[PDB]
């Protein structure tokens, strides 16, 4: 697909048996997700945004759905205002930007 | 050109006739620019993202040139961590996202 840039380009995920509503972000290097588990070994890690740092917890090899196209990555979980899909993972469904 | 997103997509832009490095950000709204000097009037405006907020200076119809493409319009100024290009800019370069 061509996704235009009008509005928020906003797409359902699935992860963890969960539909999600996040955003495409070129300009996230990393995926991150508001409050909810996930199985596996998990280690805190921080990352810093336009407001400063937020405290996550990073869990690994998660596997993610994203417009029907499946994907594997490191998925960061903790109190982000928005749900973001970051570059580990657009590369991974081929997502490019075009001009 | 077709950007992929295995680094981060940061392009040069020129704005008031200096070059400076910027972030092709899907994820923004707004363009948002570190601290420097435009001409005019300003507006105040605060931007929410990851780990809270700042306060910027809002100029409107300013001339920036992206990756060599013109386009005219706001610019937000403020402590942001890296030059940003928003969606009000990216649309105007004609900018999608594609899988
Ligand atoms: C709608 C919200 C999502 C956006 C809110 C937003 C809205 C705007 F109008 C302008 C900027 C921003 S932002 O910069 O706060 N941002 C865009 C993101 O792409 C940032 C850009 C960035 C990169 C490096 C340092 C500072 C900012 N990345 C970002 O937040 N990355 C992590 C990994 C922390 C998620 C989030
Ligand atoms: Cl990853
Ligand atoms: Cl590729
Ligand atoms: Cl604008």
Redesign the interface.
């Given at each position: 697909?061509?996704?235009?840039?009008?509005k928020?380009?906003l797409v359902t995920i699935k992860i963890g048996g969960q539909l999600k509503e996040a955003?495409?972000?070129?300009?996230?290097?990393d995926t991150?997700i508001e409050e909810m588990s996930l199985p596996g070994r998990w280690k805190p890690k921080m990352?810093?945004?336009?407001?400063?740092?937020?405290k996550v917890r990073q869990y690994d090899q998660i596997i993610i759905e994203i417009?029907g196209?499946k994907a594997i990555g490191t998925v960061l979980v903790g109190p982000?205002?928005?749900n973001?899909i970051g570059?580990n993972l657009?590369?991974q469904?081929?997502?490019?930007?075009?001009?």
């Open positions: 697909p061509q996704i235009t840039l009008w928020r380009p955003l495409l972000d070129t300009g996230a290097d991150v990352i810093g945004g336009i407001g400063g740092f937020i417009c196209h982000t205002p928005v973001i570059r657009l590369t469904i081929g997502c490019t930007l075009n001009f």
